[PDB]
Structures are given as structure tokens and as C-alpha cells.
């Protein structure tokens, strides 16, 4: 028996499970299963001069290739100053990942492959399409751009255009459509929804996410979780992307339009992707109640939305900056700073020492196992407020209680609550092996007090 706090952080940890399981009817798969089903027909770039990258050149047509008119596409018309704009980030995005590099330019010697870029006009093209690294038009992919199709016009951060831009370079470097009128009953796996990939053609809605209401809009403008995955095992993960301490969401250092927010109705939606340094979620610009988790390969509920930001397995985030609303903050097993900010937090800092700050609000510091927090490796609360914060350790306990005395006797379950004022530094420490000795601590600054525990 733990407490409501401890089953929100535990039920919210375990909300976006994959694998070994049916949901819809349908075999859950992992991101690893899943980027096999992405990268199954075979199909790739080689790395012609060898050298660990693949070196891809594109280019934006000027005039319409040897035998353009037998296509049936119609009137050929070349990329405009936007839409160029637009596919040089989509390209960056992917590069970003994987060890792919893009450079615009003609087909060179030393290149491994040759990229085109290029708008048509007859509807019966379809919207746009591309073509796999092993065919006879390797590299190329089209736009539709009628009086009637104008999504491709405007490509821009957040909207179709740009999504589609980004689908369909996905297409060329090899990835394949999540499945072979079709709709979501047809999948094979439960995950094929916009949420994991952006080679998918259903909606979030059908794996419960919530992004936006009907009316508008909202797509992922970069690869999701299970993109990145099939790319890097198809390309090799590109290590020196941000390798340096990078801030997300608010305050942003990503210098990418995707990873950055600037306002409280920003609709964002995700997958992180981080060579190495201390980072930083910061989601405070947000009013909504936020679960944030810092757990790889996990998803939480930003701004208002539901399982729309991840992090892409064997990356590391290091801290989580929540907002105004009654937020749920999960770090990993690494040292943490975990913030708060107004309204009523949940913070579970993990292993390792862990720095929390539960800002303003009735915050309640959770704990679900003593190596969370042992003497060699402590946790510290910098802004503990005796009589408003509780420290939850429910989970360890099992609301068994502990007995609060002045030095250990040598039975499990003594506690100790000290205090100097003068540092206002205060300190919990506990015996739960019995062991005569505190094999679990907790530093605050301010003072604890034995109410101020719920065990
Ligand atoms: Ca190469
Ligand atoms: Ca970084
Ligand atoms: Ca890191
Ligand atoms: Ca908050
Ligand atoms: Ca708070
Ligand atoms: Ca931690
Ligand atoms: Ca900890």
C-alpha cells in the first residue's frame, strides 16, 4: 500500500509500455521491432568511398528530366524559394540522426548517391511520392502543386507541407511505410500511428494521443522515435550532433524550429535526439498540467498535449524544467535537477544524486527505493517548505511508519530528522535494514519536520 502520489508516478511511468502485449487487437511492438518492420524491404544506400557516412548530393530541377512527359505528371514546375527553405531543414533533420550528409550540388564523382527535388501539376500523380534507394530513380521525389492540392505550397514548421517533406526523404534513404480503402484496422503493429513514426499514414487519435482538436492541424516536423531508430540502425546514430549541454522547449539552443517554444500555446511534438553534455527539458513556459519523464525511449504529456515530446533510446537527458500547472517530473538513473515551478508537483529524482527544486506550490518529493537516495549519493530538495511538502517514501515502507529518535538503536525502520540553523540545511536519515547505521538520506535546505514525512 503506497500512496496516491507514488501510483501516479508509477502508473504515468509505465503509460506508454511497448512490447509483449495486444492493444487494439493488435501486437505491440517495440522501437527495435518496429525499426526493422521500417527497414524491411532491404533497400539502402552504399557507402561507395568508403568512409562511415553516406554522402549524398541533391538538387533542386531546373528543367524536367530525359523522358519527363511519359511520367504522366503533367505541367513541371521547379522548387520555389520556400519550398527549398523548407526541404533543406526536413534534410537537416535527418542528417541530424544519421551518419547522412546532404550537400546541394550536381552528381559528383565521390558522391554515393544523387538526390532531385521537383514539382508536378496532375493530380493523378497523387500528393507526392518518392522512390527507394534501389530503384532506377533512386533519389527522387515529387511535389504536387495544382489548384486544388495546395498543401505543398506552403510547407512550414507544424503543418503537412512540411511533414510530407520530411515523409518522403524518410522514403528515399530507404525507409518503407509502416504496412503493406486501407485504414489503422490494417496495421500490423499497435505503434503505427503519426505519434512514432512519420512514415505512418493514421492519425495519433488511434493510439490515444491528443495533439489537437478537429479543425486544426499538427504534425511532427522531424523524424519521431521509431524514424530515428530505423534510421541509425540502416545509417549508424550521428554522435556529434549537440554534443554540448543543449537546452529543449523554452529557452531553447537546439537552432532547430522544432525543438523550440516561445509561448504557452506552442503545439510541440518531438523526439529528442543528443550526443552527450547536461540537458535540459524546459518546459516552463506552459500553464497545462505536465508528466514529464527523462527515462530514454519514453514519452510525456507537454503543453497541453499527450505523448507528443520523447526521448530516442541511448540518449540522456539530464534535467526537466516543469511549468505553472500540477506537474509529474520522472527522472532516470543519472544526476538530475529537476524543477518544479508553480502549482502542486510530483518529483521522483531516480538514482542517483539528484538536485530538486519543487518551487512554489505543495510539492511532494517521491521515493521509491532506498538506492533513490543512500548517504555515498544523496538527494537534495534546495527549497524544502516545512508544513506545504511532504517527502513520500510509501513505496519503501509500505506505510509501515518509521520511528523517529535521536540517534540509531539498531531496529529497521529508525529515522532521524536533524537540523542546523544557521545553514538552514536540514537532513532526514534512516535505517531500513536495521543495520545500525542510515543506509538512506535525504539534504534539504530548510527545515524538516517529522510531519512533513509520509511513510
Ligand atoms: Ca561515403
Ligand atoms: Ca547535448
Ligand atoms: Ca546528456
Ligand atoms: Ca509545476
Ligand atoms: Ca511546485
Ligand atoms: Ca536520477
Ligand atoms: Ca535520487
Known amino acids: 500500500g503506497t500512496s496516491s502520489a507514488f501510483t501516479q508516478i508509477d502508473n504515468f511511468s509505465h503509460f506508454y509500455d511497448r512490447g509483449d502485449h495486444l492493444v487494439n487487437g493488435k501486437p505491440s511492438f517495440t522501437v527495435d521491432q518496429v525499426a526493422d518492420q521500417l527497414t524491411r524491404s532491404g533497400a539502402s544506400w552504399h557507402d561507395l568511398n568508403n568512409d562511415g557516412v553516406i554522402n549524398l ?7 524536367p528530366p530525359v523522358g519527363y512527359a511519359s511520367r504522366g505528371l503533367g505541367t513541371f514546375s521547379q522548387f520555389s524559394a520556400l519550398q527549398k527553405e523548407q526541404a533543406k531543414l526536413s534534410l537537416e533533420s535527418w542528417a541530424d540522426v544519421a551518419k547522412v550528409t546532404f550537400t546541394e550540388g550536381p552528381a559528383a564523382r565521390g558522391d554515393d548517391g544523387h538526390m532531385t527535388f521537383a514539382n508536378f501539376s496532375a493530380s493523378n500523380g497523387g500528393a507526392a511520392f518518392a522512390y527507394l534507394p534501389n530503384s532506377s530513380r533512386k533519389g527522387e521525389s515529387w511535389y504536387l502543386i495544382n489548384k486544388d492540392y495546395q498543401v505543398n505550397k506552403t510547407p512550414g514548421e507544424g503543418n503537412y507541407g512540411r511533414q510530407t517533406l520530411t515523409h518522403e526523404i524518410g522514403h528515399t534513404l530507404g525507409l ?41 492541424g499538427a504534425y511532427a516536423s522531424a523524424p519521431l522515435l521509431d524514424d530515428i531508430a530505423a534510421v541509425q540502425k540502416l545509417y549508424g546514430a550521428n554522435l556529434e550532433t549537440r554534443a554540448d549541454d543543449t537546452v529543449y522547449g523554452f529557452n531553447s539552443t537546439a537552432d532547430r524550429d522544432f525543438y523550440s517554444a516561445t509561448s504557452s ?88 544524486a539528484d538536485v530538486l527544486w519543487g518551487g512554489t506550490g505543495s510539492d511532494t518529493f517521491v521515493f521509491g527505493a532506498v538506492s533513490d537516495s543512500t548517504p555515498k549519493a544523496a538527494d537534495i530538495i534546495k527549497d524544502f517548505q516545512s508544513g506545504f511538502d511532504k517527502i513520500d517514501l510509501t513505496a519503501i515502507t509500505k506505510l509501515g511508519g518509521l520511528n523517529f529518535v535521536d540517534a540509531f538503536t539498531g531496529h529497521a525502520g529508525d529515522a532521524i530528522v536533524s537540523y542546523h540553523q544557521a545553514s538552514n540545511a536540514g537532513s532526514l536519515q534512516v535505517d531500513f535494514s536495521g543495520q545500525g547505521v542510515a543506509d538512506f538520506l535525504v539534504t534539504t535546505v530548510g527545515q524538516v519536520a517529522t510531519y512533513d514525512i509520509v511513510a
Request: avoid cysteine; aromatic fraction near 10%; proline fraction near 1%.
Open 57 to 63: 548530393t541533391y538538387t533542386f530541377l531546373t528543367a
Open 176 to 216: 518503407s511505410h509502416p504496412g503493406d480503402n486501407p485504414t489503422y484496422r490494417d496495421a500490423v503493429y499497435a505503434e503505427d500511428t503519426r505519434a512514432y513514426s512519420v512514415m505512418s499514414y493514421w492519425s495519433e487519435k488511434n493510439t490515444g494521443q491528443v495533439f489537437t482538436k478537429t479543425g486544426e
Open 265 to 352: 500555446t506552442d503545439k510541440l511534438i518531438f523526439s529528442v535526439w543528443d550526443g552527450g553534455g547536461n540537458d535540459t527539458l524546459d518546459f516552463s513556459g506552459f500553464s497545462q498540467n505536465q508528466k514529464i519523464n527523462l527515462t530514454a525511449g519514453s514519452f510525456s504529456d507537454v503543453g497541453g498535449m499527450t505523448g507528443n515530446v520523447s526521448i530516442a533510446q541511448g540518449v540522456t537527458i539530464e534535467n526537466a524544467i516543469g511549468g505553472s500547472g500540477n506537474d509529474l517530473l520522472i527522472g532516470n538513473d543519472a544526476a538530475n535537477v529537476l524543477k518544479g515551478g508553480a502549482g502542486n508537483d510530483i518529483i521522483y529524482g531516480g538514482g542517483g
